[PDB]
């Protein structure tokens, strides 16, 4: 019959998910063990937290 009927809804689907992080490059301390200028001895290793 004549009139106005509500059938469904509408929704704009999104694209291009975006992830943003700050300049978190504070320390990254691996140059003291990986490529030390003078490598540590065999039995006196260096422990660096």
């Amino acid at each position, epitope marked *: 019959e004549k009139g106005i009927y509500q059938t469904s809804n509408f929704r704009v689907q999104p694209t291009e998910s975006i992830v943003r992080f700050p300049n978190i490059t504070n320390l990254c301390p691996f140059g003291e063990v990986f490529n*030390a*200028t003078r*490598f*540590a*001895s065999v039995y*006196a290793w*260096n422990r660096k937290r």
Partner: nanobody, 116 residues
Framework: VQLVESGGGLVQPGGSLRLSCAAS????????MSWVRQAPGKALEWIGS???????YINPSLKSLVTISRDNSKNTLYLQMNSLRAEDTAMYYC????????????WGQGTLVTVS
């Protein structure tokens, strides 16, 4: 510098030479000590090393003229090299806590030596 060395000078080929560097506390020499020198135009040449008890191992390449005396109360150790040849016009160094690693050793300055 907290580590000084005494000895050297112009010596006729064949003389003797000595170096003196000392510490103060009994526990500062834990646990490894050695010696090293850098002649101009020469790479690193390790000679010998010893632990607290005094057991020594020496590089076999130049192990014929090695003699070392050690003290504990004076907190010292001496590397004595004799028969001064014409290839020792460089600077020497003694090191405390040699094996502790890259950041666990303290270096010195040495003295000039003239050889003909």
């Amino acid at each position: 510098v907290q580590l000084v060395e005494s000895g050297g000078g112009l010596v006729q080929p064949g003389g003797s030479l000595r170096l003196s560097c000392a510490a103060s506390d009994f526990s500062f020499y834990d646990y490894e000590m050695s010696w090293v020198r850098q002649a101009p135009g020469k790479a690193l040449e390790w000679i010998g090393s010893m632990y607290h008890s005094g057991r020594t191992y020496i590089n076999p390449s130049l192990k014929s003229l090695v003699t070392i005396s050690r003290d504990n109360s004076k907190n010292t150790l001496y590397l004595q090299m004799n028969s001064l040849r014409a290839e020792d016009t460089a600077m020497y160094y003694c090191v405390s806590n040699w094996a502790s690693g890259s950041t666990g050793d303290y270096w010195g300055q040495g003295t000039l030596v003239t050889v003909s």
